[model samples]
Target: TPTTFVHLFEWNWQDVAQECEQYLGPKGYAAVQVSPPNEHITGSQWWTRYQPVSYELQSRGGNRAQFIDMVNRCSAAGVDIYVDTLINHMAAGSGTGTAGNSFGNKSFPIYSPQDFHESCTINNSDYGNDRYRVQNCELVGLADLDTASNYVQNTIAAYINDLQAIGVKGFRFNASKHVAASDIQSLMAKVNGSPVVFQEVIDQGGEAVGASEYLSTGLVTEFKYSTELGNTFRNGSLAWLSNFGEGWGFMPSSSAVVFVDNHDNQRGHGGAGNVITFEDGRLYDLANVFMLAYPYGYPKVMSSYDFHGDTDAGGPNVPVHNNGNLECFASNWKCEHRWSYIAGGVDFRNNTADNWAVTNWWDNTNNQISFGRGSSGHMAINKEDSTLTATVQTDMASGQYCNVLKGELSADAKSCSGEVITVNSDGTINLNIGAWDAMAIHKNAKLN
Candidate 1:
């Protein structure tokens, strides 16, 4: 039932545990997708997290004890853990200088030569050659694992089983698209009983490989949805989201873990386009409102630090120029989750978990989106203009409702009102996406 998972990018384990207890759990984030929990050749560069020298739970984030404790603590607080497993490859070919272990037949400056099995050099012939080489060959010069091998499978499975035994719930299979589908299935079959698996099959609308290849094994990552959300919301094209469904090639409503952006793309690391971030939070709020208010997909909202064009950077993504007060720490990250709307939504989500599907749907040309979950809840958004109102149609029986947007039910929906929606007998409402904000209401609210 707890669906949302935040990609806690580059956050240290202690920081994450504190956040889980202090913020995430309270906010109803079902899971925290953490950075690679493995020991890598530590580097000053963030990419070091991606480069895995070994499978030991010590990487860019923290050491093994911190890792296990973070997972346990977060789980204790009701939030699940989703690890970003970099199993596809090993340390980058950084010679012996960057790599600390010798892998396979290859030895470089950073690492001492060590024998690694199931790994071999993949050349241009492997590029489009199909799934075999992708999984068997190295990625970005990192030592590739022979996932099909019993030894490799059992080794990874042991780690996963250990995580499961400790209560970590799921995994994000990084670079699934570059691995063999069968290998993924084989690998997942071993860990399937332990944890939920979500493969990063980056198939964007009509792309080469389909995400379906891996969905049977676990939830597949929906990259196109981010692009779609960005493109539509960038120019106030709010109504385009009304038809949120499978026709868009998006995974089924429940299976997809939807978000506006992630670590890679948020800072322009991967594919960059119409992404609206904390920097553009006004639009972000508009998008988030639609996402929360909608019944489709398991939404994973992003709470990011700010940034200025450096895609691959991390640790407080925002710069001092964005907000002076926010510059308490160098490279202060925009913790969007701390923002009121998101914070309030967290409460709204927890309180209304049973009423979890979008119910009432209302819209118009002025960039407004309004919807309710069953009879107990309703939400509206006014994207640009103001003073607009809409009617709500649900089984509330016409009593005063609390506004979820302002964190008060039984409180006047007025102070809480952003865009407006009124109840109608036909179970449909007239609404307005009038201004720069959004609002939601529920019968459980204390209407002022």
Candidate 2:
């Protein structure tokens, strides 16, 4: 079955552990991309998490003990933990970290002047074309690490190895594009095991640092995928998605890690641009479901707390404690992953994992589209302003199938607890998709 992961960005470890047991594992999500667990600057601004004071696994997220417990519990629940490691640089300015650790301006206890690059902010003009300056210069005044230096590489590698020892299954190398490709390669070699690695290389075609440069190390974040997909869902037609992939100028399917919108992009921070977030309502849900349904690159879902007023607002607005369990449903958390259509899409992906060949393509020549995933699943999407009714090929056995997007199958599995779709003897299904909506059905949801 197709695998999907979720970015529980800035979520505390204890809450994340509970989610793994109660939702993620039960819902069939493969993993969770956690925020930077290392000790970081003291502030409510979101960017402080990225500015690390030290590698101590304690911060706004949780302390060391809580992190270990979360990891163990999530692993047992069949969900792996992929930490977001801010290895590219240490704390940029002087401040006591959340753990009460002290440091001087541009001075981390673990790193020295010799370990960092000569301080110089990155010039925007050199962003997409100049690889040398991009690697050497600081990113927005943050002290850039001299990753090529033997001492720095060894220290960073040791920190990552420590996480591996603590049962971390993978890492999202934050700001990986800032480091030289050769240095990243050497750092990976020093690690203990081949834990899954996907670097955040934002290549939007015109950037000096392309994702292809880091393919030898691990999967690259296909930023183009988010840009193109978001634009299409918002303005273009769903019919065009039938030919999605390298033909659409995306990275090779095997080498890309795709998502709708991440923490930075959702808000207007670090390289944030034209992308869809949880705030887009049904439009966002449609785009996410399509991503999960299609056999494309490795897919990830973003689950964020509701942040308004100031984009730089830090963490969850609620008190910093483990008591607000499942805050996504209550507090200011948006919990986009828990949306009915998105959660159902996770099941759809898992059920039709082996079926990659998309068949039964149908389009209204504008904003409506329908397709089947071999014989395992079928989906109809309507992006028009009004309801769409059509007789389309379902490619499944004649049976009453549960409409997973709108409702679900009952616990008994003998009938649908919500709306039901019937497939005819000729493998055709009548679809009546509403405006800005979708309908998805899979074998597991069939009631014959």
Candidate 3:
């Protein structure tokens, strides 16, 4: 099946479970990556989550018990939870943390100054030339961990093992590029089970940290995919994405974990680049839809809260009641995953998982493109200013397929609530796709 993960950035444990049960599970999403579940520095800024106070499973997301409950509930709903682990360092310049754990950059009860690297800011000039410095130095003044230390590695491994026991299926290693590849392999080796891992390595060309180097450890975050996808979908034409992966210096599809924009880049943090976010309106939606529908890397979608001028702003003050409940829309949250186009695309991806090859490709010289995933699914994207009318190959069974981009399938699956595509016996249909509109049809959504 096509597995899609959503980064529910800064969402509480109860909220995560609610979303999983009510949204992700029924919509065919594979997983949700929650923010750092461990205890972190006490602050209103979101970056505080990245600076850990202890391995204690307690934070703004919820306490240890609530966290465990969420994992179990989400798993039962057929969605795995991936934790954003902050094993790379402790609180940069500490005070007490959310869980009342006391710690400092150089002084923590669990770690001493020797456990951390001597403070040195990473020089951008050495990013491509000196991998050692890039790995050793601090990132934006945050304390860096000495991954080579056995104590450090063992502590990190134990934290991961604890999460795994609590039902987390994977992890997103924050500041992964700051740690040595060998150290990462060693740390992972100590882990009890083979948990899925995707290290955060922002390799946007011409830097020492190439994602390829970390592939041996686990899947590397393909930031290049975000940059190229943003550029092509926003300013350029969709035609350019036809030769996306190999042509654009992306790693092999299986080795990469891709997203349009993560919490960091979306807020202009951590080597932020030219990427589109929810603020971009139609362009952002189109890029995300293209990501899910295309046969490329493992896709991760972003579901974040609304942050204004302050980049380091904390999560929205949405009152999440007990038992993982909150109305996302009512609380200033930008639940992009719930968007009709993006959520429906998840269904499209799941239906077309078996069809790896992109078949029946078509494109206008301008910003319009269409393609089919074998006989499983088909999609047409019209990005031009005017409406697009053309006869295109759908490459599916001759039937009436619900255009899932706008609406949904009825209860009995016998009717469509939105526009329908009637595929003829010859696998062609007259597509009247409009400006900034996308049409997607899958076999599962067929009315006949």
Candidate 4:
């Protein structure tokens, strides 16, 4: 019942709706995790969106009408809209939000100093040894909310209720580790939709609070999955990823939300480590391909705009929409999720979702690796400097399958537009994957 989700980081609602209709629906995306819909502080830096002034569904992304419109359109196109809810803290200093809400005295229409935790900024030393400090203290001068309070909980719940009013399928609880785990559970109950909830807890291990603490709250983001996968793909070996999930010391598979990179850590934000981003070029592509093929946590693809170099730089200007669509991978936008191969991975994951067991695991004990998603799909990734030519084992029956990584099936689904591999009757297929390239084949892409 799951495919994949994409974090359309810093994208306008119009562009998001266009992408959902034109590409995401057809390519098999479960949801689009958009930036915060609520109104946020004014600034050129993208982090300004994190410093919300009010929950009015108006921010740099779009206004209330436009956002709801996008949701309606995307839902029709078969994509769920996931709002990135910001309830951890409000604007740091005095200013008005994008929605024209006044916060000149660090007070908002719904929040004020009484609702905030006593002022104390979090420091490096507070992370592991000081749970109280990390949870109660301000994060970089921002006013942290006392999330455990009844008034605070109900206010945050009402904010989510407004979003749910627009048919939002779920929410990504932002900076969740800063909020008490018990309060998070209470907040979810108040929302009461049992809507898909994924908490953004950046637990990289040895922290004062780990992601495991929030499992009862909802699906928790495994930031360790991000940093570790980056290293395995960028610096380590692909074969090392064979035992990549819970055995690798991550939380349970079903409760974890995984990703290659995200908005915050892609820059030098907290939880940043040896992570891979679009700037890494093909390596990034191959890593995402691996994530899609690998049967672990639900992979959330990151769709980013180019903001390289300056850490505090904001996203590129909202892409101009023309003729009901926007051009991707242009004008400072890095539409990595639109890459054909990435779509292939998305399709492959969806095509074989019913078959969760990983079979036919084979590797060169190095960068070249191949695996099967039972009989529904199979994938091969070569990170080495040469082609990986071999007759690999698969659970899928013999058939001519479209190599979704580099090609697509013809409109009639009768032929592959690119390489077509003919498998033998014994569930074996010949593969010739190139250096640092990848290939994925699924039964849905097979030609009858």
Candidate 5:
């Protein structure tokens, strides 16, 4: 059972622990990707965390003790912790700026530990500046660390070490492809000593550096899978999904991290493009059903809060307390994972195998789609100007089936009565579709 890792982006340690204990762990999620828990420059701008200031266990989330406690508690709850180590670089230069009080008082020692004198501040970076500048130069004015430097690698590894010490199980290396491949290899040499690593190398098939460069060390991000799945799902071609694996130029099963949408790209932040969001309820259900139904690489579902369409918003926007705590996610965070279909999909994933592709597809070519997953799971979508009906093969004995999404897939096959379901003799189940609705059934489920 490959548990999905919900990137709980920008959530505080306390909020994360509560989520893991109450929801994610129970849902069979393998882990949660917490934002960088390091001493970062406090910023009104959200991207400030992207610019690493130091390795101290402090940031918008919580401090060292809080972070360790959160990780341990979540682990006890059966949810692993994944850290986003912004090890590729340090904070960009902004003059006297928002350096922490210690840096301002010339007391914090990391600036000197990084050997500031040798670090070159990039003025006019050479996209053509050769690999050196790309490795050493600024990324949009952010300090691009020369990870080849032993001291630099050591400084970067400090955050990774902190994560390891806190019982973190994996990582989502942000902006990974921006650095040189060898430097990343070197960094991985340091990190591979850890359990798992999923580098976010955003190469959409045209970049000079391919994901293979990083696969030597860890699981490279499969950016194309989401794009292809989004396209196929939106275009009403779930059958084409049968070839969702390596047939689409995406990585094979091992080195891929697939998802419907992510934090950065979902809101058009990181090389945004043809993608889907929680905005479309109907489509999200279809896409997630297809994703979980079909076996794909390490799937990482983006469980976010209701952000309307604002891409720059943070999780449950509110001030932190003196005791190091965050506010409840009353309205901001959209817990898409809370959706019935999504939760069912999580359950289906835990019980299905990777080779199990969709079977018995039933669709109208434009609105609704339904199919079987091997023999254990099934889902249907009703997406049209009107209701549609279709029949697909199933293993349900005969009676009522509790709809995995709505609590019952069939009340009465004839008139759609009772949450109770009735099946035909040919092992085929007749299903009705409401205007823009969906239904899913699982095998061994009670027909009545």
Candidate 6:
């Protein structure tokens, strides 16, 4: 069972297909969460991907042919594709779409003025008390759809069914909080394939719409996980994370998609300005490492482009490749998922999936914590400025295992790079984790 997935934000189709065969599938990524493939208003800014102009797969992500090829290649390579579906609304104003379609104030090919809600913009106070205003009104001047309409539901379902015909295995329902739960269920019931469905609901309390509403349809993106974890790892202590997850007022583990930061909050669109993005350096890696190694919701690792603090900026605007030479592309593409420690965390999660309960829990009562996953894996993280050298208890049998944080397991499986840590007969290892560093090992990496 593939557990972890990566959001290759703003990546083109060819690149996604390339990664599917060349890197992601081999690296244990369950799926690639891509940017919206639907046709949108013409622009280089990333937000253009969110506003739907038409259902044609002809946006920056690529054409219908490229998307089909991408799906086949990724599926063949044993990786799935999760599309970002912009179903809540259509284009904002009159403009030419990326596919050369004409859209005006209300009259597109498939959508008429009657298809839209009464012209009204959402107010800031609406989210706090008025659920009707939040769902019925336009967001940021974008056209809001009357999802309750039968024609609208069937049209959106037709688009999703089209995607399913191409072998797409998952979907990320964009802005589900803005759309009511009944509407989401109605739309989802129309999807033929039993694809992995997850919704993006910005529920962080004090909001009229709750995340629980959408759970019956599929997993919901846990925004509170990102905000709380980001603030804890960024300003608070790591020891405080011992009792995180659902205990901290999030959705259940089986009904959540968690991340350290997403495409939205990294640029300050959501997450209440509390997130640790790629620019946060080692701390970001530490945060992701914690999220991956620790048992929680389905963790989504973010591989993003550097926006340089400009909220509306576009991506690298060119082809980004992975030849194994550059760490960060000079063109402003930050492939955070490929970072050594982050990749290690992915492997750790995959290897330890069978053991969900945390065992051998050890913490310095500060920012240093060490734990194991039953008898399958162990990880020690030091977030403090001081080095952590301790003999920690674990549940593994005695064996020599490779630390994947610094090096990779060789192709032959018999050999792997990195210093081997030996677990004694007593299931204990003397580990020395440097300040701002980590050590991880699993049974699969053991050398008898």
Q: What is the TM-score of each candidate against the true structure?
A: 0.84, 0.96, 0.96, 0.97, 0.84, 0.97
Q: lDDT by residue for model 2 over 1-448, one digit each (tens)? A: 5399999878888788888988889889999999899999888887888888888887988899999999999999999999898768887767798888888766787887778888887898888678888999888888888888888888888989999899999999999888888999999889887999999987777788778889999988998888888888877878889889888988889888999998888876544445888777888888988998888899999988777657888766563234755455554887887899899888899999878878978899888988899899998888899988899987799989998987888788887866898999999987877898898999999884
Which whole-number lDDT from 0 to 100 does residue 396 have in model 5? 44
Report model 6's TM-score to 2 decimal places.
0.97
Q: By the TM-score metric, which is better: model 3 or model 6?
A: 6
* Candidate 5 lDDT by residue in tens digits, 1-448: 6557777767778777777877788778888887777777666545667766567777888777888889988999898888887766666554322335344322234655344324454443343335455456556656555567877777677667667866888877877776777777777666636668888887666544567778877788888877777776666455455456888777778778888988788878654456888776678876886676666787777766666656555555653221454333345666677677777777677765533666666666555677666656667766666766567777545555666665523434332222444467777777776776666656634543
lDDT of 4 by residue, 1-448 (tens): 5579999888899889988998788787899999888888888888888888887887898898999899999999999999888878988889778988888555788887799888998998888899999889998898989898999999988878877887999989888888889888787788866799999998877888888899997899988888898888867888888889989999999998999888888887864557898888898888889889888888899888777688888877657355655556765777888887887788889888888988979999989999998889999999999899988988888879888988888889888887887778998887888898888999888997
Candidate 6 error regions (>4 Å): 322-331, 412-414
Q: What C-alpha lDDT, on a 0 to 100 scale, does residue 403 get in candidate 6?
A: 91
In the range 242-305, model 6's lDDT, one tens digit per residue, is 8788788888999999999999888878866669988888988889889998898999999988
Candidate 6 or 1, higher TM-score: 6
Highest TM-score scorer: 6
Model 1 global lDDT (CA atoms, 0 to 1): 0.66
lDDT of model 6 at position 406: 78
Whole-model Cα lDDT of every candidate shown, in order: 0.66, 0.86, 0.85, 0.86, 0.67, 0.88
Who is ahead in lDDT, 5 or 6?
A: 6
List candidate 1 stretches off by more than 4 Å: 95-137, 316-331, 355-357, 409-434
* TM-score of candidate 3 on Cα atoms, chains taken together: 0.96
Cα deviation at 133, candidate 3, in Å, is 1.6
